[PDB]
Amino acid sequence: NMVETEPVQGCRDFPPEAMRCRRHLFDVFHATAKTFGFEEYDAPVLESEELYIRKAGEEITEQMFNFITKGGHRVALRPEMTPSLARLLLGKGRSLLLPAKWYSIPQCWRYEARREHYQWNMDIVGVKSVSAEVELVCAACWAMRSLGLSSKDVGIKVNSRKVLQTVVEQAGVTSDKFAPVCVIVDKMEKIPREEVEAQLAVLGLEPTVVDAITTTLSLKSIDEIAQRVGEEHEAVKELRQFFEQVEAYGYGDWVLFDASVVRGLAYYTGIVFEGFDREGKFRALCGGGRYDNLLTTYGSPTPIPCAGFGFGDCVIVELLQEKRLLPDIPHVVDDVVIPFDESMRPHALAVLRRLRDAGRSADIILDKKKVVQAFNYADRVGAVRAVLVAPEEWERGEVQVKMLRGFAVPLDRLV
Amino acid sequence: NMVETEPVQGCRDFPPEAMRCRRHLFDVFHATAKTFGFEEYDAPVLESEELYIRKAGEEITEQMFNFITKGGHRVALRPEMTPSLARLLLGKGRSLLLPAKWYSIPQCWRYEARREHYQWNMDIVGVKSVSAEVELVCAACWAMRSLGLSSKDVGIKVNSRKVLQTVVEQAGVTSDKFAPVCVIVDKMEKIPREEVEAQLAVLGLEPTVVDAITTTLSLKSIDEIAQRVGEEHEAVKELRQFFEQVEAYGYGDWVLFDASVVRGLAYYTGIVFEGFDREGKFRALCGGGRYDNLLTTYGSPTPIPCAGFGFGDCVIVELLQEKRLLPDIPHVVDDVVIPFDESMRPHALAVLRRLRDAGRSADIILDKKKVVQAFNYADRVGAVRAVLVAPEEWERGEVQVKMLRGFAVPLDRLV
Ligand SMILES: N[C@@H](Cc1c[nH]c[nH+]1)C(=O)O
Numbered sequence: 001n002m003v004e005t006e007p008v009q010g011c012r013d014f015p016p017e018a019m020r021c022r023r024h025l026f027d028v029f030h031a032t033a034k035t036f037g038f039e040e041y042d043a044p045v046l047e048s049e050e051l052y053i054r055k056a057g058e059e060i061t062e063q064m065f066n067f068i069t070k071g072g073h074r075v076a077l078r079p080e081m082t083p084s085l086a087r088l089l090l091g092k093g094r095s096l097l098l099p100a101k102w103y104s105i106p107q108c109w110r111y112e113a114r115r116e117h118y119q120w121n122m123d124i125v126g127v128k129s130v131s132a133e134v135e136l137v138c139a140a141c142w143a144m145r146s147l148g149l150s151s152k153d154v155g156i157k158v159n160s161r162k163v164l165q166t167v168v169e170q171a172g173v174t175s176d177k178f179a180p181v182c183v184i185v186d187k188m189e190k191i192p193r194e195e196v197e198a199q200l201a202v203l204g205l206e207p208t209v210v211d212a213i214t215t216t217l218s219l220k221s222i223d224e225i226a227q228r229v230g231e232e233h234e235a236v237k238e239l240r241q242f243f244e245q246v247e248a249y250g251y252g253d254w255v256l257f258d259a260s261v262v263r264g265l266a267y268y269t270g271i272v273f274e275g276f277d278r279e280g281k282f283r284a285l286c287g288g289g290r291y292d293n294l295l296t297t298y299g300s301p302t303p304i305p306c307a308g309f310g311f312g313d314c315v316i317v318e319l320l321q322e323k324r325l326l327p328d329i330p331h332v333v334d335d336v337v338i339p340f341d342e343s344m345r346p347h348a349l350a351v352l353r354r355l356r357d358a359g360r361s362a363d364i365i366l367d368k369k370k371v372v373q374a375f376n377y378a379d380r381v382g383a384v385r386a387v388l389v390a391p392e393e394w395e396r397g398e399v400q401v402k403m404l405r406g407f408a409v410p411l412d413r414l415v
Numbered sequence: 416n417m418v419e420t421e422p423v424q425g426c427r428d429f430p431p432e433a434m435r436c437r438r439h440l441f442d443v444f445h446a447t448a449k450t451f452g453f454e455e456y457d458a459p460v461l462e463s464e465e466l467y468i469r470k471a472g473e474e475i476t477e478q479m480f481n482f483i484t485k486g487g488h489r490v491a492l493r494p495e496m497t498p499s500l501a502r503l504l505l506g507k508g509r510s511l512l513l514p515a516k517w518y519s520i521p522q523c524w525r526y527e528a529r530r531e532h533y534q535w536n537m538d539i540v541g542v543k544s545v546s547a548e549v550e551l552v553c554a555a556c557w558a559m560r561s562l563g564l565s566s567k568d569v570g571i572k573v574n575s576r577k578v579l580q581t582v583v584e585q586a587g588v589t590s591d592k593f594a595p596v597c598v599i600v601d602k603m604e605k606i607p608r609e610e611v612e613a614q615l616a617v618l619g620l621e622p623t624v625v626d627a628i629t630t631t632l633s634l635k636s637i638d639e640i641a642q643r644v645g646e647e648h649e650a651v652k653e654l655r656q657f658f659e660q661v662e663a664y665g666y667g668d669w670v671l672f673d674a675s676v677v678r679g680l681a682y683y684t685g686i687v688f689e690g691f692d693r694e695g696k697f698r699a700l701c702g703g704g705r706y707d708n709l710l711t712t713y714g715s716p717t718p719i720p721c722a723g724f725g726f727g728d729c730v731i732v733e734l735l736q737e738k739r740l741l742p743d744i745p746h747v748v749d750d751v752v753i754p755f756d757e758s759m760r761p762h763a764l765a766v767l768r769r770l771r772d773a774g775r776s777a778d779i780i781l782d783k784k785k786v787v788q789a790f791n792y793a794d795r796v797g798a799v800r801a802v803l804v805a806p807e808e809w810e811r812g813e814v815q816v817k818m819l820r821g822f823a824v825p826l827d828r829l830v
């Protein structure tokens with residue numbers, strides 16, 4: 001029998017073909033981070049399970065890929081990066097210089113009865129003002145633009161949880177139900193409205209409060225939220241500022257207000273946002289927001305404002321494929337060095353060294369094969385040039401070069 | 416209280432400082448792979464535990480970080496990449512084109528009562544001749560050279576298991592004890608010779624056979640192995656060819672013969688090799704060899720020759736640090752855009768866009784701060800240029816640029 005060739009249940013293999021696609025995407029994530037002044041970090045995929053106990057009914061924490069070690073504790077393959085980021089920030093001492101702009105491209109994990117995805121994370125730490133969210137949304141737009149998408153293809157929808165926070169506060173509800181409410185109300189587009197209301201009732205919320213919540217989610221303009229919660233309410237000022245700053249940067253066509261956007265995570269406190277395709281065909285492309293309390297929650301002596309997003313590797317690829325923006329780009333190499341026969345191998349190796357020393361990418365024919373088969377290989381591997389190392393030419397201090405009709409060239413002029 | 420800021424027991428955090436070091440190393444691994452014509456792949460860190468059942472007493476398999484899922488099976492965080500590579504190769508159909516040269520930089524895991532390391536893997540598939548091992552050893556040398564090491568610092572020791580294979584065969588021992596013998600004999604430098612002999616006796620090996628094994632490991636020349644097993648023995652021809660090919664490529668000073676090198680993995684069948692520091696201060700820098708039977712073992716209908724190495728991220732870094740070849744390279748960015756005050760923020764954002772559109776890396780001051788504090792930040796983040804966006808200049812279609820005494824420059828001439 002054969003060994004099992006399929007990977008573990010919910011997990012992806014990346015042979016070279018699929019890896020090029022992933023690298024194409026990751027190259028954009030690194031390049032955009034660099035363009036925006038963000039610094040790379042990483043942490044272990046294995047974290048203490050205690051890091052993810054939030055008690056808000058979040059899908060992210062419910063679907064934890066956890067297990068017990070033995071000697072150690074209860075651990076989990078990380079379902080997200082943000083708790084790890086906060087751990088690193090706190091573990092950094094007073095030596096953490098603010099503002100800090102950190103990014104990573106972690107694999108994250110889930111379990112249900114797709115268990116693995118990569119997620120670009122970008123976070124700005126120590127910045128109170130909406131300029132953090134502006135920069136983050138602009139980075140997400142820049143990355144999509146770098147991938148060949150335009151504002152005709154995609155948008156980013158923006159809201160502030162401070163609106164719903166006030167509506168909930170003024171209705172007489174305890175603030176400890178706010179996060180679970182956000183979590184439930186996040187389900188609006190996914191489940192029937194009566195079911196959202198049913199779940200809010202199970203939380204103990206009165207029908208008039210539920211209606212207030214319902215209503216605010218469906219207001220189509222910022223001017224309309226200004227009517228409900230006050231024109232100088234801090235969400236109104238912050239959203240106006242957010243839009244005017246994104247407009248000034250030149251991404252006005254990419255962004256829009258949507259009162260129904262809350263996101264599914266407990267810890268967002270301010271502006272929240274979600275990337276979407278304008279044909280309404282795919283799930284969220286990316287999502288994030290401000291989370292000013294999380295570090296306090298983790299034991300920071302002083303509050304540290306934060307905002308950030310995650311941008312998954314799966315939805316974006318489906319969208320780019322639909323838009324024909326991910327053609328296969330076959331493997332290439334600059335040179336294939338071809339020994340005329342095995343006696344020429346030592347000389348061909350010196351030639352291969354010379355080429356690589358000059359910054360070229362180059363293969364040599366490894367097993368014994370005829371020149372015609374060697375040219376076949378050169379075509380297969382996508383060589384720009386074949387360098388044939390034959391006895392006559394070698395005597396003259398030359399090799400034969402064919403751009404892929406073969407011409408003798410002095411060794412020195414190869415590079 | 417604070418959340419636990421330390422990572423899970425045997426695992427490393429990579430905040431930006433430490434991440435730069437890792438990126439410096441990984442950049443070399445990618446660059447060397449590219450130079451040598453290797454193609455990147457990846458697979459899930461989670462694999463079926465069945466993939467690693469070899470029954471040879473290997474340290475690698477004994478120290479498995481395994482667990483049971485629930486719905487799924489018995490799984491492990493991969494202790495090595497080679498089984499995953501073989502799975503991918505087999506899962507690729509007749510559509511696998513040979514020879515193939517594939518590389519990856521996986522995190523690998525172990526458990527003992529350091530649990531995590533990254534390991535550059537390079538493997539050549541479908542090549543019978545020693546030219547595979549030549550190319551692989553040259554790649555390891557090229558990577559170390561790229562990191563600033565020379566043949567004065569490091570070497571690669573080379574042997575062939577075919578020598579010990581014959582000695583074991585001629586002594587009348589069953590071939591199913593060969594791998595476990597290799598595994599035990601790998602321990603020679605680590606444990607007393609009598610203990611190696613003790614372990615070989617526990618395997619059921621007779622004292623005269625043990626002595627034959629002992630003796631062959633201590634022969635200092637290939638000419639001496641030629642005396643024992645025959646001058647045209649295939650290990651002798653292959654080692655001679657290996658050395659002459661590495662010499663021709665120009666790395667003769669990096670490589671040497673050592674009859675004691677066997678490596679600790681069950682599946683090596685031919686040439687094996689190990690990178691080492693010439694001061695005798697560190698553990699193996701890298702290690703690999705030919706493994707012609709593994710794919711057959713996994714159910715390949717036809718034999719597929721393979722050779723490859725792993726190159727860890729931990730020993731090399733300790734060595735480079737000792738040699739002062741890993742200085743911190745602080746973060747830099749091309750431009751910091753400084754609004755003169757908050758009213759200038761929209762204009763500063765248009766300027767930031769312009770700079771980034773031109774391929775520059777640039778920050779803007781995010782929170783409100785005084786110009787003097789903004790210059791402090793610019794120094795902190797390692798900006799090459801501060802771009803001050805002030806009212807007077809803006810009116811003239813200009814900004815102020817300071818190389819890090821401030822001069823007015825037309826917007827267009829910024830880039
Ligand atoms: N951790 C969030 C994304 C995020 C990063 N920073 C803030 N939010 C998620 O997984 O959706």
Ligand SMILES: N[C@@H](Cc1c[nH]c[nH+]1)C(=O)O
Pocket residue numbers: 494495496497536537538680702703704722723724725
């Ligand atoms: N898997 C080996 C290295 C290797 C890669 N290819 C062949 N050997 C190890 O972990 O040491």
